Amino acid sequence: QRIGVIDMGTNTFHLLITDIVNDRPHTLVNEKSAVGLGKGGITKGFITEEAMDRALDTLKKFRVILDEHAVVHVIATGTSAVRSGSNKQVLIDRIKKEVNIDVEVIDGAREAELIFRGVQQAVPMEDHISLAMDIGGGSVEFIIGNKNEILWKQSFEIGGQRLIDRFHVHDPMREDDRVMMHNYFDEVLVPLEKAINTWRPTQLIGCSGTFDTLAEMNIQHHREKIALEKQTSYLLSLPDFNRLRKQLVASTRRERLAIAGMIELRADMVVVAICLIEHVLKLVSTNAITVSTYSLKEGVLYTMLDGVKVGS
Ligand SMILES: [Cl-]
Numbered sequence: 001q002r003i004g005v006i007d008m009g010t011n012t013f014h015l016l017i018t019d020i021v022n023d024r025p026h027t028l029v030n031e032k033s034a035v036g037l038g039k040g041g042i043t044k045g046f047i048t049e050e051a052m053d054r055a056l057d058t059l060k061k062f063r064v065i066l067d068e069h070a071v072v073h074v075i076a077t078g079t080s081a082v083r084s085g086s087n088k089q090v091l092i093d094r095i096k097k098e099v100n101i102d103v104e105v106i107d108g109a110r111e112a113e114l115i116f117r118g119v120q121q122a123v124p125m126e127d128h129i130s131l132a133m134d135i136g137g138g139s140v141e142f143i144i145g146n147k148n149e150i151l152w153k154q155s156f157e158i159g160g161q162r163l164i165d166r167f168h169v170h171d172p173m174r175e176d177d178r179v180m181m182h183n184y185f186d187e188v189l190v191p192l193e194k195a196i197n198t199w200r201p202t203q204l205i206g207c208s209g210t211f212d213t214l215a216e217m218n219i220q221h222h223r224e225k226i227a228l229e230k231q232t233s234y235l236l237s238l239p240d241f242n243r244l245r246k247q248l249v250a251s252t253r254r255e256r257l258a259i260a261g262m263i264e265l266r267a268d269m270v271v272v273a274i275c276l277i278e279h280v281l282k283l284v285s286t287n288a289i290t291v292s293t294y295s296l297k298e299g300v301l302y303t304m305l306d307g308v309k310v311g312s
């Protein structure tokens with residue numbers, strides 16, 4: 001039948017609708033909407049009224065699109081901003097009343113697992129031990145695995161909206177800001193360092209909006225005739241990453257707002273995100289970065305198609 005998946009992310013909500021004919025899935029809708037669920041509240045442990053109202057607006061629109069495609073099987077996941085918010089049940093109950101969708105709140109571990117199922121479908125890793133990283137506005141998930149297995153995974157509440165709200169990063173970034181961020185990452189990421197030492201991944205994979213934007217910027221810079229919508233991976237060399245890093249660290253918020261595809265909430269957090277990627281790169285001896293165009297919503301879909309329960 002047709003399957004609809006909603007990812008209620010901290011910055012951006014996503015809607016994926018897939019038809020599955022002759023056991024082959026085909027995308028009917030892949031839509032996003034900037035919601036800013038974390039704005040004004042995430043580091044203080046709540047969701048604001050304005051953010052809840054934006055969320056409901058977007059969900060009313062997504063409900064129309066679901067109905068316009070006669071979708072029967074729907075699953076809507078709530079992740080970092082939803083699970084973190086003391087008033088999450090207010091939002092969940094408003095959603096049920098307004099559009100008759102039940103939000104499935106998933107913890108960080110399960111979010112990481114589901115993301116990696118999407119990565120496995122997008123990037124054929126063979127037996128290569130790989131570190132995948134998903135940077136969102138609220139959390140960052142890290143998974144070590146290969147085509148068949150997850151060896152280790154962990155979610156950390158260090159998504160970009162949290163980072164820019166908890167710390168004062170200057171516009172543009174200063175040397176002392178770089179010290180601040182990498183010192184913080186040193187403290188937070190100890191379990192990641194330990195896992196990397198244990199499993200020795202040899203490749204780095206990134207997914208979600210920050211990585212999609214880096215890919216799109218690189219495509220434009222090299223004048224590549226590549227629609228990222230029509231392929232499931234994109235390899236970014238380390239020299240290309242370092243060009244983008246230098247460009248974005250030097251940039252102002254206003255300059256970033258002018259980059260094609262760089263939505264406002266991503267412009268706000270992309271510099272701290274690139275600092276985190278650099279930090280992780282120094283821990284791995286990868287040869288390049290592979291961007292997976294699949295992330296949580298695709299992992300949910302493929303988990304469903306596998307015949308496996310999504311929640312937990
Ligand atoms: Cl926080």
Ligand SMILES: [Cl-]
Binds near residue numbers: 110
């Ligand atoms: Cl967890």
